[PDB]
Design a protein around this motif. Structure first.
Motif, PDB file in Angstrom:
ATOM      1  N   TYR A 100       0.955  -1.464   0.233  1.00 12.75           N
ATOM      2  CA  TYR A 100      -0.416   0.044  -0.233  1.00 12.75           C
ATOM      3  C   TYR A 100       1.112   1.140   0.061  1.00 12.75           C
ATOM      4  N   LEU A 101       1.362   1.101   1.452  1.00  8.09           N
ATOM      5  CA  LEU A 101       2.495   2.455   0.823  1.00  8.09           C
ATOM      6  C   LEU A 101       2.863   3.023   0.272  1.00  8.09           C
ATOM      7  N   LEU A 102       3.903   2.002  -0.703  1.00  6.65           N
ATOM      8  CA  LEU A 102       4.472   2.591  -1.423  1.00  6.65           C
ATOM      9  C   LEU A 102       3.384   2.960  -3.308  1.00  6.65           C
ATOM     10  N   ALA A 103       2.099   2.421  -3.227  1.00 17.17           N
ATOM     11  CA  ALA A 103       1.042   2.987  -4.091  1.00 17.17           C
ATOM     12  C   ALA A 103       0.450   4.058  -3.706  1.00 17.17           C
ATOM     13  N   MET A 104       0.063   4.577  -2.112  1.00 20.19           N
ATOM     14  CA  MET A 104       0.703   6.039  -2.315  1.00 20.19           C
ATOM     15  C   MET A 104       1.906   6.736  -2.716  1.00 20.19           C
ATOM     16  N   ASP A 105       3.167   6.836  -2.727  1.00 27.48           N
ATOM     17  CA  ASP A 105       3.862   7.238  -2.625  1.00 27.48           C
ATOM     18  C   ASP A 105       3.984   7.727  -4.096  1.00 27.48           C
ATOM     19  N   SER A 106       3.442   6.556  -5.193  1.00 25.17           N
ATOM     20  CA  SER A 106       3.519   6.812  -6.533  1.00 25.17           C
ATOM     21  C   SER A 106       2.169   7.773  -6.686  1.00 25.17           C
ATOM     22  N   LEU A 107       1.285   7.771  -6.362  1.00 23.59           N
ATOM     23  CA  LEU A 107       0.568   8.333  -6.735  1.00 23.59           C
ATOM     24  C   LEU A 107       0.315   9.938  -5.312  1.00 23.59           C
ATOM     25  N   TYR A 108       1.462   9.986  -5.127  1.00 28.09           N
ATOM     26  CA  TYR A 108       1.923  11.488  -4.209  1.00 28.09           C
ATOM     27  C   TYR A 108       2.762  11.828  -5.693  1.00 28.09           C
ATOM     28  N   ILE A 109       3.988  11.065  -6.375  1.00 30.55           N
ATOM     29  CA  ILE A 109       4.388  11.886  -7.179  1.00 30.55           C
ATOM     30  C   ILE A 109       3.586  12.488  -8.439  1.00 30.55           C
ATOM     31  N   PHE A 110       2.813  11.433  -8.927  1.00 25.69           N
ATOM     32  CA  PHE A 110       1.442  11.756  -9.800  1.00 25.69           C
ATOM     33  C   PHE A 110       0.959  13.033  -9.373  1.00 25.69           C
ATOM     34  N   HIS A 111       0.882  13.550  -8.640  1.00 28.48           N
ATOM     35  CA  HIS A 111       0.075  14.747  -7.974  1.00 28.48           C
ATOM     36  C   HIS A 111       1.326  15.438  -7.853  1.00 28.48           C
ATOM     37  N   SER A 112       2.493  15.681  -7.901  1.00 33.06           N
ATOM     38  CA  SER A 112       3.595  16.553  -7.637  1.00 33.06           C
ATOM     39  C   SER A 112       3.807  16.971  -8.960  1.00 33.06           C
ATOM     40  N   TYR A 113       4.443  16.015  -9.699  1.00 28.27           N
ATOM     41  CA  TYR A 113       4.521  15.949 -11.428  1.00 28.27           C
ATOM     42  C   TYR A 113       4.014  17.065 -12.123  1.00 28.27           C
ATOM     43  N   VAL A 114       1.348  16.311 -11.552  1.00 30.25           N
ATOM     44  CA  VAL A 114       0.541  17.397 -12.449  1.00 30.25           C
ATOM     45  C   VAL A 114       0.868  18.742 -11.773  1.00 30.25           C
ATOM     46  N   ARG A 115       0.769  18.623 -10.417  1.00 28.97           N
ATOM     47  CA  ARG A 115       0.899  20.105  -9.733  1.00 28.97           C
ATOM     48  C   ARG A 115       2.317  21.294 -10.344  1.00 28.97           C
ATOM     49  N   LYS A 116       3.791  20.338 -10.909  1.00 26.86           N
ATOM     50  CA  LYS A 116       4.647  21.001 -11.202  1.00 26.86           C
ATOM     51  C   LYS A 116       4.138  20.727 -12.758  1.00 26.86           C
ATOM     52  N   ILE A 117       3.380  20.376 -13.061  1.00 24.56           N
ATOM     53  CA  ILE A 117       3.088  20.910 -14.685  1.00 24.56           C
ATOM     54  C   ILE A 117       1.881  22.046 -14.688  1.00 24.56           C
ATOM     55  N   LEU A 118       1.226  21.801 -14.172  1.00 20.36           N
ATOM     56  CA  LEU A 118       0.609  23.025 -13.839  1.00 20.36           C
ATOM     57  C   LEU A 118       0.769  24.454 -13.481  1.00 20.36           C
ATOM     58  N   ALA A 119       1.904  24.707 -12.490  1.00 18.90           N
ATOM     59  CA  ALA A 119       2.894  25.912 -12.117  1.00 18.90           C
ATOM     60  C   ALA A 119       3.674  26.150 -13.138  1.00 18.90           C
ATOM     61  N   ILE A 120       4.350  25.881 -13.746  1.00 13.86           N
ATOM     62  CA  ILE A 120       5.455  26.213 -15.058  1.00 13.86           C
ATOM     63  C   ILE A 120       4.610  26.850 -15.854  1.00 13.86           C
ATOM     64  N   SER A 121       3.834  26.417 -16.653  1.00 16.47           N
ATOM     65  CA  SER A 121       2.813  27.211 -17.784  1.00 16.47           C
ATOM     66  C   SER A 121       2.938  28.936 -17.436  1.00 16.47           C
ATOM     67  N   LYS A 122       2.722  28.983 -16.118  1.00 16.94           N
ATOM     68  CA  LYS A 122       2.553  30.965 -15.992  1.00 16.94           C
ATOM     69  C   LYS A 122       3.600  31.134 -15.683  1.00 16.94           C
ATOM     70  N   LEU A 123       4.552  30.697 -16.016  1.00 10.46           N
ATOM     71  CA  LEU A 123       6.359  31.214 -15.698  1.00 10.46           C
ATOM     72  C   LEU A 123       6.509  32.412 -17.530  1.00 10.46           C
ATOM     73  N   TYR A 124       6.289  33.273 -17.349  1.00  2.61           N
ATOM     74  CA  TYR A 124       7.038  33.802 -17.976  1.00  2.61           C
ATOM     75  C   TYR A 124       7.945  35.355 -17.735  1.00  2.61           C
ATOM     76  N   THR A 125       9.529  34.939 -19.165  1.00  5.48           N
ATOM     77  CA  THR A 125       9.877  36.547 -18.543  1.00  5.48           C
ATOM     78  C   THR A 125      10.869  36.498 -19.748  1.00  5.48           C
ATOM     79  N   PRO A 126      10.983  38.282 -19.723  1.00  2.00           N
ATOM     80  CA  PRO A 126      11.678  38.747 -21.327  1.00  2.00           C
ATOM     81  C   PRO A 126      13.502  38.151 -21.650  1.00  2.00           C
ATOM     82  N   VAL A 127      14.384  37.772 -20.224  1.00  2.27           N
ATOM     83  CA  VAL A 127      15.267  36.925 -20.235  1.00  2.27           C
ATOM     84  C   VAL A 127      15.725  35.768 -20.734  1.00  2.27           C
ATOM     85  N   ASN A 128      14.439  34.543 -21.030  1.00  3.11           N
ATOM     86  CA  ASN A 128      14.825  33.222 -20.924  1.00  3.11           C
ATOM     87  C   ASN A 128      13.874  32.998 -21.918  1.00  3.11           C
ATOM     88  N   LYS A 129      13.789  32.831 -23.520  1.00  2.00           N
ATOM     89  CA  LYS A 129      13.180  32.226 -24.478  1.00  2.00           C
ATOM     90  C   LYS A 129      12.587  30.477 -23.702  1.00  2.00           C
TER      91      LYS A 129
END
Lengths: 499, 501, 56
Positions: A100-129
């Motif tokens: 169980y605990l390992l399956a919990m870890d896997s889905l926690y990793i998935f949640h962190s992955y999708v949260r990073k995917i969401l939070a990255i897309s709002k990043l826009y800067t002129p110094v980095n294309k």
């Protein structure tokens, strides 16, 4: 020179130069000799700077093959803790609780992955294309899809957190915290504005897959690779597939109730909610930089569908059989698989002892331990069943909680229209005889040098039949042995699986 | 977290490792898989670390081809100063005084070279086996000869200093100070104990060879390359050749006395004496590191004896004839020579604009101007006289007081008995089709990566017929243009040849 | 340059170089300038005021 002090006005008018070139855009240096165009491709006027590299990791229990493994010890400890405060349900074992605990870890990793995917897309800067389309490409999503469905992505990740709140896992155990922190962050190689971003992407997950009375088995679940236009529908399909065999299981409900009774609701791990004003920001982390620098690739995971001549039944599964190995959790994978059924001669350079490179002069015990979490050296070759052994697989001496499979680098193409490029590679690159292979390898090497604490490379040539040692800048190094690495990995895994 | 704080004794017992491996010896990493011995060359268990890199430079007046050049302006200014401060002999010109000053600079460079040769030999540290045998080998001497005849070496260098100090050169001219500080020090790439040493060795000197009514002409004088076991007799021969026409000459004594009266002994440049108790120490200098990093090799010098098919009479001489160019000092050399009479394809990669890479974020004009003194880009190919053009020579757009010819790197050999190795290369490296060329080039690249502010590399391939851009880690860079570099070199030379008034 | 002529910095540099082509770096001219210096030392000499971005 007193002349500089006497004519600073002329010095200033002579030293007017434009610095701070925005990265992520192709630059042409031009010709110093205007008549050099007769040597068309004999001159390199191109100048492309890479800006992001993704470390494709994999969560692992840490090399279990008997009942003395740290995973089995933690299984026994957590089962004793749960059952000595449990008056009631007695229908599962320590091994079952740990899957169980390992399956919990896997889905926690998935949640962190999708949260990073969401939070990255709002990043826009002129110094980095590269921000954020290159990062989204590396993670394996469609930036147009994220831009169109930001609201859907936010509500999907919030619902993922809410549904992950149904089950319960201990918060004292640092497995989940380490994995979430590793997979939910952006790391710069230097503390400069136009720095390069380091990312961690889970190559695989641990679909729980209960069937048959012969215990449980964490079957591999693949993850999107870079250059895949995966959308929110695909990610929802992946999440539903992950939690398909997870809900509706009365034994899983019993385990969740028992761990809720054991660890109070305050003592559980909770996935924090996200909103529209949550900003992810690249940060400088020397520890993650060092452990990235001392990382060794192990190759692609082996699945049931992957054909391997002479190596049958070598899939990357966490087998749990009560009548096999006295019911101990068994996870003994074979490395050296790249994806195709051929030799992959470049992996032969991994058979030498690794060199642990460290910054500074004085190294603390904790820093040294954290600097070798992704390091993994092969020990022996796996015995091929049959007379045909087209691939070659190496059995590790022992690995940590994470194993690195590949590295993905995104950089601007030299040719028109100078779009992003996909580059996946292990720590070892094999270059056969070709017109463009050598120059491609040179571009690869120059791109990798841009990253400060890049993983050590082991180049090999097909014509010379000779590999090369670490292609890195050695600062303060030592030669590590398989036994020392095994001891450090045992210590780290035991510390991670602690309550 | 708490587990580390709960078993710290076992944490320490597990994390006790030997660090600070002394460089200068071949290290074998062994085999992690005992069955890997079948694949003989497919596993690289070797680990060799380079320890020194030598910059073979050449002092230059700075691209003079007219009477309007900064060297000629400085010559006129210094001659006017001397003649106005002095009353007496009027029998030499600004050009004569300026070539005298250049010859004095050459003598000072040679004295600094031999003094550094003597002082390096007394360096020993347990963590670096490159001290001092590798440094002496790079400088081009015989360490056995130095250790056998230390007393003779000290006497010879002391006599060289004594005889060079007879003549006078202005100390307000920062030319001599820059050259002495460049050639009289050892520089580490990092401020660590096991760092890599950066060194400067003059490839060419400026023997005077004054003859004829047709002015003077500073002919090249060669110097021992690395891997040459030159001894004290060879160095004495070099010194005697340098000062054969310079010691005991009445006109030279007149000029030295005039320079003394102009700049009395307080304002004169002096050579520091050397004896058994002089110790040179490696030092960390970011300015010299940056100007090493942004240095572009120009190739081997062209001598009168060097054959060049289609490029006759391109020797690296400083001509001063009163009947040509109104008696102005003339020095316009042709770059792109490697030593042999062929194409040398690797030099085509230098036709692109250079990239000035600097550390940090904000760069002052001082650092920007001091970081590009050794930089040199080609502008136009020199025309070949005749229909045969086996070599290719490139005319520079303008260079500073120094031009870097070659780079020498000393490192241990992988094979028994792991002796030192000589690796001479320009900023551009050419590899043809061969079994060992690719692995040798990879070894070269890995050795160069060890040096922190190493010069940028331009590799080209024989079967690809394609070069590659700067093989360096760019941090904060800009693309330099020929006109900007020419302005920078004009300012640098003008600041270099300055006289008080 | 007369009015209505769009002369540029290269034309003005050409004019200056033409003006001082036979005047800069000449030994007799340096002799005369030095003699005038000794006659009227630097205090009594005429000087040109420098110009930069803050001259109005």
């Amino acid at each position: 020179v007193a002349w500089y002090a006497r004519y600073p006005h002329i010095l200033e008018e002579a030293t007017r130069l434009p610095f701070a070139y925005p990265i992520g855009q192709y630059y042409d240096t031009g010709y110093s000799v205007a008549s050099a165009t007769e040597w068309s491709k004999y001159v390199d006027t191109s100048l492309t700077i890479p800006g992001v590299m993704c470390v494709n990791f994999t969560p692992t229990p840490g090399e279990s093959y008997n009942k003395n493994s740290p995973i089995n010890i933690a299984a026994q400890n957590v089962y004793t803790y749960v059952r000595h405060m449990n008056s009631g349900h007695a229908n599962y074992e320590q091994a079952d609780l740990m899957m169980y605990l390992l399956a919990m870890d896997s889905l926690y990793i998935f949640h962190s992955y999708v949260r990073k995917i969401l939070a990255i897309s709002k990043l826009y800067t002129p110094v980095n294309k590269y921000f954020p389309r290159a990062l989204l490409v590396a993670l394996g999503v469609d930036p147009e899809d994220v831009f169109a469905n930001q609201a859907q992505w936010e509500y999907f990740v919030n619902m993922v957190a809410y549904r992950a709140g149904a089950f319960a896992a201990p918060a004292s155990m640092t497995y989940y915290e380490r994995h979430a922190w590793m997979s939910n962050g952006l790391y710069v190689d230097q503390d400069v504005t136009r720095a390069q971003i380091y990312m961690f992407k889970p190559t695989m997950l641990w679909k729980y897959e209960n069937l048959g009375t012969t215990g449980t088995k964490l079957v591999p679940l693949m993850m999107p690779k870079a250059g895949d236009n995966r959308k929110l529908v695909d990610f929802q399909v992946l999440f539903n597939n992950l939690v398909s065999t997870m809900l509706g299981d009365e034994d899983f409900g019993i385990m969740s109730g028992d761990v809720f009774k054991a660890f109070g609701a305050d003592g559980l791990v909770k996935l924090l909610a996200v909103d529209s004003t949550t900003m992810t920001l690249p940060t400088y982390d020397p520890l993650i930089l060092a452990q990235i620098h001392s990382a060794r690739a192990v190759g692609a995971p082996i699945l049931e569908t992957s054909t391997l001549t002479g190596f049958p039944g070598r899939q990357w599964q966490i087998t749990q059989n009560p009548d096999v190995n006295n019911g101990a959790i068994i996870f003994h994978p074979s490395f050296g698989y790249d994806g195709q059924d051929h030799e992959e001669l470049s992996f032969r350079a991994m058979c030498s002892n690794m060199i642990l490179n460290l910054p500074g002069e004085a190294h603390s015990a904790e820093m040294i331990i954290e600097a070798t979490r992704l390091a993994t050296m092969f020990q022996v070759k796996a015995v091929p069943a049959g007379d045909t052994s087209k691939p070659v697989l190496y059995l590790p001496n022992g690995f940590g909680t994470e194993v690195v499979n590949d590295y993905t680098m995104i950089s601007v193409d030299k040719a028109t229209p100078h779009d992003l490029t996909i580059h996946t590679f292990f720590n070892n690159i094999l270059v056969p005889n070709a017109k463009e292979n050598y120059v491609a390898n040179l571009e690869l090497l120059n791109n990798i040098i841009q990253f400060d604490w890049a993983p050590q490379l082991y180049l090999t040539y097909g014509i010379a039949q000779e590999s090369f040692g670490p292609f890195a800048q050695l600062n303060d190094w030592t030669i590590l042995t398989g036994e020392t690495l095994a001891r450090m990995h045992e210590v780290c895994v035991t510390s991670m699986f602690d309550v």
